[PDB]
C-alpha cells in the first residue's frame, strides 16, 4: 500500500538529496501499476556526524516513526553508530558510503570495491615501484591490501598518510624527497577534494607531468580536476562505475537538467556525481526488493517503539527485507547490481580510464570474473 | 562528601574491575568518596556503548571511567564532546584532539620509533592487529622514507582468521624467503606468547631473532626466555617495581583473595589496571574541591535521555574537565600530568630486556627530550686512517696494540706513558668521526662511543 | 531577502496546522535548540535558493 523508508542525510550530500526525491518521484510517477504496486513515502533527517550523541538521535527519531529500510550516508565516525543500531534493530540501511571494512549484516552497500580492480592494473602496468599517498576516509581496507600486496609481491611502495596534511607545502616537500628517488609511479587514494589539492601542487610544481603516472583509486574520477597534467604529458588511469553511453544514464541525465534548482538543487549548477547516481540506484533496488515481497505475499508491520526498548526483540520481517534487498539483481546506472550475503557489490563492473598525451579513452574494464581486460 | 560517576567495564577486564575497586577504597577518606554506578558492556559495540553512557549520562553522573575500542572511539568523543561529561580511560589514547577526554595511558609511539633508531634497525618486520588499530604502524611507515627503514607489515590479527592462510604465507616469506630476524610486535599483551609461537615454528635459527614487544607491559605476562626460543626480547613498562609507591601497592596487593578481587594476589599488576587505579586517584583529587551540590537522589539511567535531555551546559561540564586536567600527581603508572587535550605529558617509559636473570630496565624515555637515554684498562677508541692507525703488514701474528702502527699509535703510547694508565686499542665499530643524526638525535662513530660509554678516550 | 524565503520555504514540509502564541524570551534558557537535523534542512534550503 504505502512503504515509507528513512534519508539520513550528511554534510555535503546535497546533490544526492535531489537525486534521492527525483527516483522517489519517478517511482511513484511511473505509469504502469505492474510496476508501482505501492507508494513509496520518506522522511528526512540532516545530521552532523561530528557527534555520536547526534547520530543515534537522528537514526532512533527515524526509527520510532517505523520505516521499512534507511537510505543513507556515514563517514568514518558515524559509520559504526549506524550499522550497529541498524544490526541490532534488523533494519535495513542503504548506503553510497565507501563500503564496510567488516563484514557486517544489514547494511547493502551500494557502491562496490575499489581494491581488486586496483591490484589488477598495478599488475597490467608492471609497478614495482611507486608512491601510494592515501587517507583513509574510505576505510583502511585498500591500504591494507597494497602492504600486503607489496610484500607478497615484492614490490618497493613508499606509502605515506596525508589525510591530516592542512599545509600544502606538506605536499610539495613530500614530492621533492620522491623526486630524490625516482619516483615516477603514483597511486593516489584519497577523497577527491584532496586528490585535487596534490594535482594542483603538481602543476604549481612544474615538471611533474611528462614522464609521469598517477593512478587516481577513487570512483569520483569525473569530479577530479585533472585537466591542467593532461596537458602536460602525465599519464593518468582513473575508474568509473557510471557509463555516459548506458541509454539509461541518458535518459535520466535529460530529465535531471530539466528540473528546477528550487526542487532539485545541484542537478544544473554541477555535473552529476556518481554518489547521485548510486543514490538512484539505491531506490530501484528498494523498489525491487518491496515489489518482491509483495509478489511473494509477505507481510511486514512493525509500532517499532523505542530504539532503546531493553530488550531488544527485533522484528521477524527484519531479516526478510534484508534478505529481499540482498536477492535483487536489476540494471541500473552503475550497471548490473547484485548483492551477497555481506550486502557488498557482486558482478559488478568498473570501467578503465586512461589519459596519454595521445589523447583519452576506456581503455577496458574490470569484473571480478574475467579480472582487467583491456580493448 | 560523595559524588556521583559511571564505570564502564568491557567483558575480560576482571583485574582492572579489582584494581578500580582497590583504588576506590585506598583513595576514599571520611570527608570524601566517589560513588561508583558500574556497567558491563560490549565495547566492541558501538550501539551497546552508546546505551551505556547515555544511561550514566542520565544518571547525572560527574564524570564516567570506561573503555573503548577502535570502532566505539569515535562513540565516546563525540558523545563527550556534545553532551560535556568528562571520560576517564585506559584505553589508546586517541591521535587528534577532542575534548571531555582525559587518556589515563601515555602515547607509545614516540618510545618506540626512537626505540628502533637505539638499535639502529634498518630493516624489520612488523607484526600488528587491524582490529586493534593502525596508528602505531603508520607512525612507523611515516618516519621508514626519512629513517630508511625496509618494513615489512603483517596483519597477525588474521592469524587464526579466513586471511589465515594468507597470513601465514606472509610470515614464511619475510622469516624464512628473506631471513628477517627483526620483529615488532604489536598486539594485545596477553597475545605475545601465541603469536611467538607461531613464529618460531616458521623461522629458522630463531635464537637469533630480536623482538620488540610494543606494548607498556613488558612485564605483564610471563617472560621466558625458552618459550622465545633463545631470541633477544626488549619492551616498554610504565609501572616501576622498583619504585616505592608501586612495591608498596603489590605488597598488599599480592594477599588480596583471588576470588573476591578477579586478578589479584599477583606479584604484578597490568598496565591497564595500574591506569585504572591511578584513574580513582586523577578523579578523587580533581573532584575533592568541587562545588557540593545539593545532595540529590541517585536513579537508574534511561539511554533514551540522551535525544530527550539538552547537554550539560558548557560552562558547567568544563570546569569538571578542567579539574580533571589540572591533576599533578605520582601513581602507579609514574608521573600523572595532563595538557590541555587531556594527554598524558612529563611522563617517563622505561626501556627493558630480557635478560639471564630475567626482565631488566636498561633505560628510559622521557616525554620531554623523546630520546633512548641508557641506564648503568682505559680503552681507547680510534680510526684506521692513514698513517694515524694503519694494521701492520703482518698483522696475523700479532694481538693487541701490537697489530697497528701510526701517528697516533705512538701518540697513545706517550700520552698513556705521561698519563700513568694501561690502554687498549679499538676500531670504532662503524667507521666513523662522529656526527649527530639530525632526526633520531644520535652520535656516531669515536664521538658516539665517547658520549654513550663504550669508550673512555678517542 | 522575501524572494529568497519564498523560494527556499515554498517547499518544506507542510507541518501541521498548528496554534502561533506570543513568545516568551525566557525561552532561550528554559526551552533546548531547535534539533540540529531540524533546523539545517532550512538553513540549506535557504543557502541553494
Not at chain 1, 530529465?255 to 534548482?261: A, G, I, M, P
Not at chain 2, 536513579?299 to 535525544?307: I, K, P, S, T, V
Not at chain 2, 558548557?314 to 600523572?336: D, M, T
Amino acid at each position: 500500500n504505502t512503504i515509507s523508508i528513512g534519508g539520513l542525510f550528511m554534510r555535503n550530500t546535497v546533490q544526492e538529496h535531489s537525486a534521492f526525491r527525483f527516483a522517489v518521484q519517478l517511482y511513484n510517477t511511473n505509469q504502469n501499476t505492474t510496476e508501482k504496486p505501492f507508494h513509496l513515502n520518506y522522511h528526512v533527517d540532516h545530521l552532523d556526524s561530528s557527534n555520536s550523541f547526534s547520530v543515534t538521535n537522528a537514526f532512533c527519531s527515524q526509527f520510532s516513526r517505523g520505516v521499512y529500510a534507511i537510505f543513507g550516508f556515514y563517514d568514518q565516525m558515524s559509520m559504526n553508530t549506524l550499522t550497529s543500531f541498524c544490526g541490532a534493530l534488523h533494519t535495513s540501511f542503504v548506503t553510497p558510503s565507501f563500503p564496510t571494512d567488516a563484514d557486517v549484516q544489514f547494511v547493502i552497500q551500494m557502491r562496490p570495491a575499489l581494491k581488486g580492480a586496483i591490484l589488477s592494473l598495478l599488475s597490467y602496468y608492471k609497478w614495482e615501484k611507486f608512491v601510494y599517498l592515501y587517507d583513509t576516509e574510505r576505510g583502511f581496507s585498500v591500504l591494507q591490501a597494497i602492504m600486503e600486496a607489496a610484500v607478497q609481491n615484492n614490490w618497493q611502495v613508499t606509502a605515506r598518510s596525508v589525510g591530516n596534511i592542512k599545509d600544502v607545502q606538506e605536499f610539495r616537500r613530500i614530492i621533492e624527497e620522491m623526486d630524490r628517488r625516482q619516483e615516477k609511479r603514483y597511486l593516489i587514494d584519497c577523497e577527491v577534494e584532496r586528490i585535487n589539492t596534490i594535482l594542483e601542487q603538481v602543476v604549481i610544481l612544474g615538471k611533474h607531468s611528462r614522464g609521469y603516472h598517477y593512478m587516481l583509486a577513487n570512483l569520483g574520477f569525473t569530479d577530479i580536476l585533472l585537466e591542467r597534467v593532461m596537458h602536460g604529458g602525465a599519464n593518468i588511469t582513473g575508474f568509473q562505475i557510471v557509463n555516459n553511453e548506458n541509454p539509461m544514464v541518458q535518459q535520466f541525465i535529460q530529465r535531471w537538467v530539466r528540473l528546477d534548482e528550487c526542487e532539485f538543487p545541484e542537478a544544473k549548477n554541477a555535473p552529476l556525481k556518481y554518489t547521485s547516481a548510486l543514490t538512484h540506484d539505491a531506490i530501484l533496488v528498494i523498489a525491487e526488493a518491496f515489489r518482491y515481497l509483495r509478489r511473494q505475499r509477505v507481510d511486514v508491520s512493525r509500532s517499532a517503539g523505542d530504539c532503546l526498548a531493553n530488550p531488544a526483540v527485533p522484528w521477524s520481517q527484519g531479516i526478510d527485507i534484508e534478505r529481499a534487498l540482498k536477492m535483487v539483481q536489476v540494471q541500473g546506472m552503475t550497471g548490473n547490481i547484485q548483492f551477497d550475503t555481506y550486502g557488498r557489490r557482486t558482478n559488478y563492473t568498473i570501467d578503465v580510464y586512461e589519459m596519454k598525451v595521445s589523447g583519452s579513452r576506456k581503455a577496458g574494464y574490470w569484473n571480478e570474473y574475467e579480472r582487467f581486460v583491456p580493448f | 562528601n560523595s559524588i556521583q560517576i559511571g564505570g564502564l567495564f568491557p567483558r575480560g577486564a576482571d583485574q582492572e574491575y579489582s584494581a578500580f575497586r582497590v583504588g576506590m577504597v585506598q583513595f576514599s577518606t571520611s570527608e570524601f568518596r566517589l560513588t561508583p554506578h558500574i556497567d558491563n558492556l560490549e565495547v566492541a559495540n558501538s550501539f551497546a556503548v552508546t546505551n551505556a553512557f547515555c544511561s550514566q549520562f542520565s544518571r547525572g553522573v560527574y564524570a564516567i571511567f570506561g573503555f573503548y575500542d577502535k570502532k566505539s572511539v569515535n562513540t565516546i568523543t563525540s558523545f563527550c564532546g556534545t553532551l560535556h561529561v568528562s571520560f576517564i580511560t585506559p584505553s589508546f589514547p586517541t591521535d587528534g584532539t577532542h575534548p571531555f577526554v582525559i587518556q589515563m595511558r601515555p602515547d607509545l609511539k614516540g618510545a618506540l620509533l626512537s626505540l628502533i633508531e637505539y638499535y639502529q634497525w634498518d630493516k624489520f618486520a612488523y607484526l600488528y592487529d587491524s582490529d586493534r588499530g593502525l596508528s602505531t604502524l603508520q607512525a612507523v611507515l611515516d618516519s621508514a622514507a626519512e629513517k630508511k627503514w625496509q618494513v615489512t607489515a603483517i596483519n597477525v590479527g588474521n592469524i587464526n582468521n579466513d586471511k589465515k592462510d594468507e597470513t601465514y604465507r606472509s610470515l614464511f616469506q619475510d622469516l624464512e624467503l628473506k631471513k628477517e630476524r627483526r620483529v615488532i610486535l604489536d598486539c594485545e599483551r596477553d597475545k605475545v606468547n601465541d603469536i611467538v609461537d607461531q613464529v618460531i615454528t616458521i623461522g629458522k635459527h630463531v635464537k637469533g631473532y630480536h623482538y620488540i614487544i610494543a606494548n607498556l607491559g613488558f612485564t605483564d605476562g610471563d617472560l621466558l626466555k625458552i618459550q622465545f626460543g633463545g631470541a633477544n626480547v626488549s619492551g616498554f613498562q610504565i609501572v616501576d617495581y622498583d619504585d616505592s609507591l608501586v612495591s608498596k601497592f603489590i605488597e598488599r596487593w599480592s594477599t588480596l583473595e583471588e576470588k573476591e578481587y578477579p586478578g589479584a594476589h599477583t606479584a604484578t599488576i597490568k598496565y591497564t589496571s595500574a591506569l585504572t587505579y591511578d584513574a580513582v586517584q586523577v578523579m578523587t583529587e580533581a573532584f575533592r574541591c568541587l562545588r557540593k551540590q545539593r545532595i540529590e537522589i541517585s536513579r537508574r539511567g534511561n539511554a533514551g535521555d540522551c535525544l530527550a535531555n539538552p547537554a550539560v551546559p558548557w560552562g558547567q561540564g568544563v570546569e569538571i574537565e578542567r579539574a580533571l586536567k589540572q591533576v599533578q600527581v605520582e601513581g602507579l603508572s609514574g608521573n600523572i600530568k595532563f595538557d590541555q587535550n587531556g594527554k598524558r605529558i612529563n611522563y617517563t617509559i622505561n626501556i627493558m630486556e630480557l635478560k639471564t636473570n630475567g626482565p631488566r630496565k636498561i633505560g628510559y624515555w622521557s616525554e620531554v627530550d623523546k630520546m633512548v637515554v641508557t641506564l648503568t684498562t682505559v680503552v681507547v677508541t680510534t680510526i684506521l686512517e692513514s698513517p694515524y692507525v694503519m694494521m701492520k703488514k703482518n698483522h696475523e701474528m700479532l694481538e693487541g696494540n701490537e697489530r697497528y702502527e701510526g701517528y697516533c699509535v705512538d701518540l697513545a703510547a706517550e700520552i698513556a706513558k705521561h698519563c700513568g694508565f694501561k690502554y687498549k686499542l679499538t676500531i670504532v665499530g662503524d667507521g666513523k668521526y662522529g656526527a649527530r643524526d639530525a632526526d633520531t638525535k644520535i652520535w656516531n662513530g669515536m664521538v658516539g662511543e665517547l658520549v654513550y660509554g663504550k669508550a673512555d678516550i678517542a
